[PDB]
Ligand binder design. Structure first.
Ligand SMILES: NC(=O)C1=CN([C@@H]2O[C@H](COP(=O)(O)OP(=O)(O)OC[C@H]3O[C@@H](n4cnc5c(N)ncnc54)[C@H](OP(=O)(O)O)[C@@H]3O)[C@@H](O)[C@H]2O)C=CC1
Ligand SMILES: COc1cc(-c2cc(C)cc(C)c2)cc([C@@H](C)C#Cc2c(C)nc(N)nc2N)c1
Length: 157
């Protein structure tokens, strides 16, 4: 299984200056619930913006840098290498990897942040014409999580 995993706002912003534009503890909980024991694939800039591998899953970084080595992180050098990875693989980031991967994934897991943020990095455009809503669950607003967000699981038609 090859899925996308992504949080994006109303205009499809996903990043700003190496950050998530927003602070949403619920979404980070959802990510580690979904991907624990699985594989996260990410471009070099996504990885460099986090800074360490994420515990209790495989962290695969895609780069053309042959010197690139980080403890706890496997390295691949072509989009093609992705398809040789055993298990449930989630495309995790970023703009440029989603651009490469969106036409190929079986499956998309999207948190829609119902806000409009300043951003520099975007998720690709997509129509529900091609994707069917497996599920749509509103996140709960509270003290810590103060932006409306919706979990969508979209499956290619
Ligand atoms: N809110 C969210 O859900 C998420 C936010 N983000 C954001 O994304 C931002 C990064 O922007 P973006 O440019 O998209 O970066 P990416 O994370 O997609 O990394 C891009 C790099 O990945 C490598 N790469 C991509 N495709 C290939 C390929 N086909 N062959 C070899 N190497 C490849 C290259 O690395 P190299 O140049 O070293 O050769 C490329 O420069 C981050 O700052 C982060 O905030 C990302 C994902 C999710
Ligand atoms: C800039 O700093 C970053 C930190 C993290 C991060 C760090 C830790 C310690 C834990 C977790 C769960 C995420 C992730 C990212 C980027 C790569 C992301 C993401 C992403 C999100 C947040 N939500 C959904 N749904 N999908 C996604 N692909 C950037």
């Amino acid at each position: 299984t090859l899925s996308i995993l992504v949080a994006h706002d109303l205009q499809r912003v996903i990043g700003f200056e190496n950050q998530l534009p927003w602070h949403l503890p619920n979404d980070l909980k959802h990510v580690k619930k979904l991907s624990t024991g699985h594989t996260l694939v990410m471009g070099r800039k996504t990885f460099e913006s986090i800074g360490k591998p994420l515990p209790n899953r495989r962290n695969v970084v895609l780069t053309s840098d042959t010197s690139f080595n980080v403890e706890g992180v496997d390295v691949i050098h072509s989009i093609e290498d992705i398809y040789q990875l055993p298990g449930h693989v989630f495309i995790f980031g970023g703009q440029t990897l989603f651009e490469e991967m969106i036409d190929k994934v079986d499956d998309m897991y999207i948190t829609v942040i119902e806000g409009k943020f300043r951003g520099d990095t975007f998720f690709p455009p997509y129509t529900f014409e091609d994707w069917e809503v497996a599920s749509s669950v509103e996140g709960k607003l509270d003290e810590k999580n103060t932006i409306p967000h919706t979990f969508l699981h979209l499956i290619r038609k």
